[PDB]
Amino acid sequence: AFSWRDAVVYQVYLRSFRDANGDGIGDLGGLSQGLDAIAALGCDAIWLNPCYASPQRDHGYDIADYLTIDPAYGTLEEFDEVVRRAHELGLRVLMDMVANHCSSDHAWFQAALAAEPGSDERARFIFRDGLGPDGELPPNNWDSVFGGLAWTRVTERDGRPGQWYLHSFDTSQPDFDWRHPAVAEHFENVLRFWFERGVDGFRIDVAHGHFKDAALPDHPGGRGPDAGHNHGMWDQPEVHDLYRSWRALGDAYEPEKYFVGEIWVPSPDRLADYLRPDELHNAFSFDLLVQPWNADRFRKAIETGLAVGRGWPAWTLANHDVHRAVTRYGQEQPMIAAARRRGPADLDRGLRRARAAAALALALPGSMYLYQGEELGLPEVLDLPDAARQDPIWTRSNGTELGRDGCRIPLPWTREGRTFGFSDAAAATTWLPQPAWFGAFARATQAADPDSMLSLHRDLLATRRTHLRGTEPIVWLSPAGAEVLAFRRGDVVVVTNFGSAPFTPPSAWGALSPLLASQPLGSATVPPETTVWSRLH
Numbered sequence: 001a002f003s004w005r006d007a008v009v010y011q012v013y014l015r016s017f018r019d020a021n022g023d024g025i026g027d028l029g030g031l032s033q034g035l036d037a038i039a040a041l042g043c044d045a046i047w048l049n050p051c052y053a054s055p056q057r058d059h060g061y062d063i064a065d066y067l068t069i070d071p072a073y074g075t076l077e078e079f080d081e082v083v084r085r086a087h088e089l090g091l092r093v094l095m096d097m098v099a100n101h102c103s104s105d106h107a108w109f110q111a112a113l114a115a116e117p118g119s120d121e122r123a124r125f126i127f128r129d130g131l132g133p134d135g136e137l138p139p140n141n142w143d144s145v146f147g148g149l150a151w152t153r154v155t156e157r158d159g160r161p162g163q164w165y166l167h168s169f170d171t172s173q174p175d176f177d178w179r180h181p182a183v184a185e186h187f188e189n190v191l192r193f194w195f196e197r198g199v200d201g202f203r204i205d206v207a208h209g210h211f212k213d214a215a216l217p218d219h220p221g222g223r224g225p226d227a228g229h230n231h232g233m234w235d236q237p238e239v240h241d242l243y244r245s246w247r248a249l250g251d252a253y254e255p256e257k258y259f260v261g262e263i264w265v266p267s268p269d270r271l272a273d274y275l276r277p278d279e280l281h282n283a284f285s286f287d288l289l290v291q292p293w294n295a296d297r298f299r300k301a302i303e304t305g306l307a308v309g310r311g312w313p314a315w316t317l318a319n320h321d322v323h324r325a326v327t328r329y330g331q332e333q334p335m336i337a338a339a340r341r342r343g344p345a346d347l348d349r350g351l352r353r354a355r356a357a358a359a360l361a362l363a364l365p366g367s368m369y370l371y372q373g374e375e376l377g378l379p380e381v382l383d384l385p386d387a388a389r390q391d392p393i394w395t396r397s398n399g400t401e402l403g404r405d406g407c408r409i410p411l412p413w414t415r416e417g418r419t420f421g422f423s424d425a426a427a428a429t430t431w432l433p434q435p436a437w438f439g440a441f442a443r444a445t446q447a448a449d450p451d452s453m454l455s456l457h458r459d460l461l462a463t464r465r466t467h468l469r470g471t472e473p474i475v476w477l478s479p480a481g482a483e484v485l486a487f488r489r490g491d492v493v494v495v496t497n498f499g500s501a502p503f504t505p506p507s508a509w510g511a512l513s514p515l516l517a518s519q520p521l522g523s524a525t526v527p528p529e530t531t532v533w534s535r536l537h
């Protein structure tokens with residue numbers, strides 16, 4: 001039967017999955033068409049990046065209406081059909097909860113801008129007087145995650161500059177005041193609304209956000225690279241009461257709803273508090289995602305994930321915010337900055353390592369989140385033309401930080417077609433341009449090739465379901481620091497040879513016959529940069 005503990009979740013970046021309407025934008029009609037492909041791959045659930053009404057200044061994470069689907073993606077009726085079709089295929093459905101902030105076009109925030117200092121409208125956000133004799137300094141020294149100030153100054157109704165409002169992310173994403181009672185009430189209503197439509201749970205955006213220190217103190221570390229975690233801006237005690245309330249709400253349903261947090265905090269003990277039994281079910285294990293190709297760093301990150309997750313963490317190797325794994329591992333090897341390195345990526349090296357890494361991560365106890373396109377071995381499109389970039393990171397850095405658009409390129413479905421089957425002929429230009437070579441990675445081509453990245457993922461998910469029991473914990477076979485990672489789970493032994501020479505496992509690891517491998521191999525040595533799953537006799 002289905003279990004969240006062992007779920008393999010396909011992350012659907014809807015804008016770039018499949019364009020059924022022919023407007024150049026991935027949409028719900030396209031997702032409906034592609035659900036058969038997700039289930040055939042072997043996945044257990046889908047998580048949709050936010051598809052609510054949004055001006056797309058942060059591509060869905062700036063929400064203007066939490067109770068409606070963006071008209072570019074479809075109607076609520078089409079959404080209901082997607083949910084029922086997914087369910088009919090056995091796929092559970094996670095939506096994306098974005099409650100730290102809303103779009104500046106949300107009706108509440110437009111009302112706040114039009115209201116006076118001290119109004120209730122502004123009290124639902126974080127508006128403060130500026131510092132300096134004319135208020136020209138921001139109220140404190142906080143940085144936007146996307147670069148620049150975390151505050152924007154507004155014009156008051158006398159036409160002169162006045163108060164500033166806080167935005168942890170883009171200027172167009174004002175942060176709520178989570179101490180204002182209307183905010184919590186609104187988000188309980190949002191949860192209930194979507195749960196009523198059969199949504200099975202939420203991925204929680206900025207789960208370390210929502211509450212800040214009520215005094216909004218300056219970060220003593222400053223703005224610089226090694227300023228450190230801004231303790232006043234994130235990860236406050238009140239956020240745990242919030243998740244207790246959401247968990248209690250979700251636990252009233254049968255089956256109970258599911259919550260996975262997107263949490264970025266440095267301390268594993270701080271992270272673990274989000275996963276206490278009355279709070280969130282899980283959180284992405286980002287330590288592994290940011291590691292370079294290195295056996296020792298992988299092992300340490302896996303150890304951290306297993307402790308924080310109490311034995312069944314939520315693993316992921318890529319998402320819509322970081323460089324694709326084929327690029328990360330194909331580059332020369334040296335928090336989130338580690339997953340956004342620039343420089344030449346060797347495609348064959350990156351594909352080899354990405355295959356081995358997928359095979360390793362899918363053997364770990366717990367759940368696994370596959371970002372769309374990773375099952376095709378897509379590289380990051382680093383050479384996107386300047387003019388095509390849309391990520392606020394690009395604009396706010398004046399072009400000195402590339403941003404995330406290179407992992408959001410519309411997927412290739414067929415070798416043929418001007419958009420590689422992402423849309424039909426008659427369709428508008430795609431919202432981000434696909435490179436001329438994307439057709440080489442087409443899903444249909446890979447499905448027909450037993451050696452493809454897609455076929456490897458299909459084999460892994462099939463073998464994971466038949467041979468890997470969720471109740472069997474890791475028994476480490478290799479020692480700390482080894483260049484070859486090896487463990488046993490029940491009667492399956494997993495070996496990842498991170499190095500460039502073949503490796504012969506010591507006979508004490510058992511009498512092994514191979515189940516699958518991320519490369520060819522009929523010997524008992526593990527080829528370079530290869531993962532092998534074997535049955536233990």
Ligand SMILES: CO[C@H]1O[C@H](C)[C@@H](N[C@H]2C=C(CO)[C@@H](O)[C@H](O)[C@H]2O)[C@H](O)[C@H]1O
Nearest residue numbers: 058061098145169205206262264321336
């Ligand atoms: C290092 O992580 C930081 O930067 C990341 C980009 C953020 N990720 C989420 C936060 C926002 C803001 O809604 C969207 O722009 C991202 O796509 C979403 O996945 C993290 O919450 C934030 O802590």
